[PDB]
Structure formats: C-alpha cells, structure tokens
Design a protein around this ligand. Structure first.
Ligand SMILES: N[C@@H]1[C@@H](O)[C@H](O)[C@@H](CO)O[C@@H]1O
Length: 362
C-alpha cells in the first residue's frame, strides 16, 4: 500500500533540497513570506503526527531569524507582526502548533503577542465587526484574515492562562462570522465582504470560493468545541466540509479529487498554489475531532476516505523525483498544482500544499 509518513518525509526533503536557503533560514525568498509560515506549519505537524524530530533544529533556526523585526515593516517590532493581519495570522498559528509539539512557553508567548497585534484592527463601526487585512489601506474585511484570527483566539482559549477573555473573543467572533453573510446558500465561504455606497451595510461580494477559506474555519470550530464541549460547533464544521466533498459544488471532481477553480484555466498564482494543502490539514483535524466525539467506529469515515482518495491520485499523477548525482545525494519527491493533472513544474507553494495532504493522512 501507501505509507504517508515516508512520503511526507520524502516531500519535505524535496522541499528542502529545492527551496530551503540556509543563509536566510527561509524557503524561497522569491515567494511570499507568509507561505514560508505555512511551510513551517506543515513540517511542525509532520513531526507532531509522526513522532519524529528530524527537522526540529532546522525549524528552530527559521523561527529565530524570522521572528526578528521585518525589513518591510519595522513598526511591527518583530515577533511575526507584519504589515497585514493575515500574514501575521499564519505565523501565529504555526507558533501555536510548535507549542503543541514542544511545550515550550516561549512559542505560546509569540501567539499571545500576535493576538493583541491583530485585535488592533478589529472595528465594530464597519460591518458590525471583523478586522481588516490591509493594515495600511484599511479597505477590505475578507474571509481568510478573520478565519485565521478566529482560530487564534479559539486556540488561546485552550492554552493561555487568561483563557476566559480569549473564549469570549472567539464566541463573539464566530457569531459575527456566521452573521456576516460570507457563508453562502450552499454552506461555502466566498472571499470577503463589500460595503454599500449609501447605507454602510456589508454583504457577500460573490468573489471566488477558495479551498483554504473552507479549511481554516474547520480548525477554529474544532478548537471552539474543545473549549466548550458543545457539539454545535462540530455540526457547523461538518456542514462546511460536506459541501466541499459534494461533487455538485465544483470543488470535488467526478473522480473525487479536490480541484481549485483556477486549475481549469491554468491560472493559479503563487498564493492559490498552496490553498488545497491547508484545507486537507484542517479537514484531518475535523475528522479526528468527530471520531473522538462519538463511539461509532465509522465516525469521520467519509473525511478519512476522502483524504485517502486524494493522496493516491496525487501520488500517481502529480509526482516527480529529483535526479541524484555523483555530488548531491539529495532525494525526495516534487509535486505540481493539480492533484490529478500532469506534473510540469514544481514551486515552493505547490510543494508545501503537497506536504499537507500526506501529513493529513498520517
Ligand atoms: N501583505 C500582503 C499579503 O496580504 C498577501 O497575502 C501577500 C500575498 O503574496 O502579499 C503581501 O505580503
């Protein structure tokens, strides 16, 4: 059969062999900085799920260098506080993951500083809540920045000392998200909100449905369930996941393979190339929560079967290996954007999205 642990390591080795820069403690400086944060999350989650620790030294190096004041946003004063609330959000959740792996309180402190940073741009005056993504411009309250924040306050509600304040924030934040209108008629989440030019009211902008906007929200609801023991959060998360798995919604193909909307026109940019892996990692978190919340042995079987179906299609149609030489003994696997389509090239976001699918099957 297929061993996801050995393939996750092979995919991580291909990511490092092709894109890691030892002189910068970062993957691919030519790619968005926040995707290096997603990459660290995939590697941390691999170690936590496989019990390994082979990349712990490398990961600790990345944190030490990237936690310094960013050259393009010095006013953030480091600790992953950047010029966009979602850029900060990806690194903050990675620090929550590292705290889960190591138990070192230093990493939890970074998440606490990041929560207080992002909360600065939550306003009740526009759309009745939510935070902005563009710290400099302050014109867009989108879905991904509010999903990252919601999963951050919900995670702190289970780990931080002053857990009650964080639980109140998460409960008020989910209530705003649910009532914002970003969740549409088929329980899928569009990109963000638009504002009426005359009334000041906000509404679903009907922008595309991206896969990672259906995943981060699942992990936030799992943390909310863990902090309240209320299964109502799991049932809402299961409705969002079921809509993704339904082939009638255009995100799951007739073969059962997850497909970004940009794959048909072959126009997935550097951001969209990483989306699918973020969903698969969060879906596996939902499945673990569903299987434990009930005694039925088939609990969460559809989510595990879905991840297994997608792992096999990527393995067979999207794989390519690096050429070993007489000098470089580097080995591993490379992957493209389509988890069923052909392999043409490999980019760091595509590779990080592929790691997440294997780690979701561990
Ligand atoms: N600050 C922006 C982010 O909001 C955005 O997500 C990335 C995308 O590349 O570019 C910049 O870093």
């Amino acid at each position: 059969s297929l061993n996801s642990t050995g393939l996750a390591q092979a995919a991580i080795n291909g990511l490092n062999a092709r894109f890691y820069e030892s002189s910068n403690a970062r993957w691919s400086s030519d790619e968005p900085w926040w995707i290096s944060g997603v990459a660290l999350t995939m590697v941390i989650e691999y170690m936590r799920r496989s019990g390994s620790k082979e990349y712990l030294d490398q990961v600790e190096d990345v944190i030490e260098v990237q936690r310094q004041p960013l050259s393009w946003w010095p006013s953030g004063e480091g600790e992953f506080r950047a010029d966009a609330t979602d850029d900060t959000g990806w690194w903050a959740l990675a620090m929550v993951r590292m705290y889960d792996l190591t138990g070192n309180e230093d990493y939890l402190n970074i998440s606490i500083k990041d929560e207080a940073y992002m909360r600065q741009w939550w306003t009740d005056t526009e759309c009745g809540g939510g935070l902005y993504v563009d710290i400099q411009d302050l014109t867009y309250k989108n879905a991904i920045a509010n999903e990252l924040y919601l999963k951050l306050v919900a995670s702190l509600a289970n780990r931080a000392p002053n857990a009650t304040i964080y639980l109140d924030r998460a409960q008020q934040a989910w209530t705003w998200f649910l009532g914002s209108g970003m969740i549409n008629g088929v329980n899928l989440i569009n990109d963000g909100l638009a504002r009426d030019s005359n009334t000041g009211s906000c509404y679903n902008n009907r922008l595309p449905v991206w896969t990672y906007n259906q995943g981060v929200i699942l992990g936030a609801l799992v943390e909310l369930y863990h902090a309240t023991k209320d299964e109502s959060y799991l049932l809402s998360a299961q409705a969002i996941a079921d809509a993704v798995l339904s082939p009638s919604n255009g995100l799951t193909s007739s073969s059962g393979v997850l497909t970004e909307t940009c794959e048909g026109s072959d126009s997935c940019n550097q951001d969209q190339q990483v989306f699918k892996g973020v969903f698969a990692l969060n879906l596996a978190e939902l499945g673990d929560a569903v299987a434990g919340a009930s005694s039925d042995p088939d609990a969460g079987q559809d989510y595990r079967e879905y991840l297994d179906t997608n792992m096999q299609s990527m393995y067979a149609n999207d794989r390519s290996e690096i050429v070993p030489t007489l000098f470089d003994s580097s080995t591993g696997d490379l992957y493209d954007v389509s988890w069923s389509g052909p392999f043409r090239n490999a980019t760091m976001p595509k590779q990080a999205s592929a790691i997440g699918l294997y780690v979701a099957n561990i």
